[PDB]
Amino acid sequence: LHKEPATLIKAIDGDTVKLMYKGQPMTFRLLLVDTPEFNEKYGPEASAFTKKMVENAKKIEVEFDKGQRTDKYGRGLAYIYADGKMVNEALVRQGLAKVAYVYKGNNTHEQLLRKAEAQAMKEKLNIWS
Numbered sequence: 731l732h733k734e735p736a737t738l739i740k741a742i743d744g745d746t747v748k749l750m751y752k753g754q755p756m757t758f759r760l761l762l763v764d765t766p767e768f769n770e771k772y773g774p775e776a777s778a779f780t781k782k783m784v785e786n787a788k789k790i791e792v793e794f795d796k797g798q799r800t801d802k803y804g805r806g807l808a809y810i811y812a813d814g815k816m817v818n819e820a821l822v823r824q825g826l827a828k829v830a831y832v833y834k835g836n837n838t839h840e841q842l843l844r845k846a847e848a849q850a851m852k853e854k855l856n857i858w859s
């Protein structure tokens with residue numbers, strides 16, 4: 731897998747973000763994670779977390795997996811990196827997202843995220859308290 735440049739357009743919530751990719755605006759949905767909707771418990775905290783992470787980054791990168799790059803809603807499906815730190819992984823680590831939507835084509839970083847989830851559960855963080 732390889733990392734591609736991209737620029738913040740707008741934070742949306744815990745696991746979606748509007749980015750410019752190859753000069754085009756696009757909504758990206760984070761692979762392998764599920765944050766609560768904003769109207770749910772830890773929803774605002776998740777939105778806030780992803781927001782600080784992408785807004786404070788000097789460099790945002792997009793990294794597609796091996797399968798699907800676009801979902802049925804036309805959202806890009808990717809691992810997003812903020813100055814070298816994976817947002818997907820950081821949300822899980824903090825117990826602000828659960829590992830989810832693990833599909834056969836796009837699961838490269840699955841073990842790494844379940845590792846972070848076990849560790850966040852161990853600490854009873856946010857979702858897991």
Ligand SMILES: Cc1cn([C@H]2C[C@H](OP(=O)(O)O)[C@@H](COP(=O)(O)O)O2)c(=O)[nH]c1=O
Nearest residue numbers: 759760761762763764801802807830831833
């Ligand atoms: C994370 C992810 C979600 N999706 C689809 C499945 C879900 O369909 P349904 O809407 O039919 O339940 C939806 C959930 O996304 P949200 O969690 O952002 O709503 O997005 C994918 O197709 N691929 C993916 O990698």
Ligand SMILES: [Ca+2]
Nearest residue numbers: 764765766767
């Ligand atoms: Ca969600």
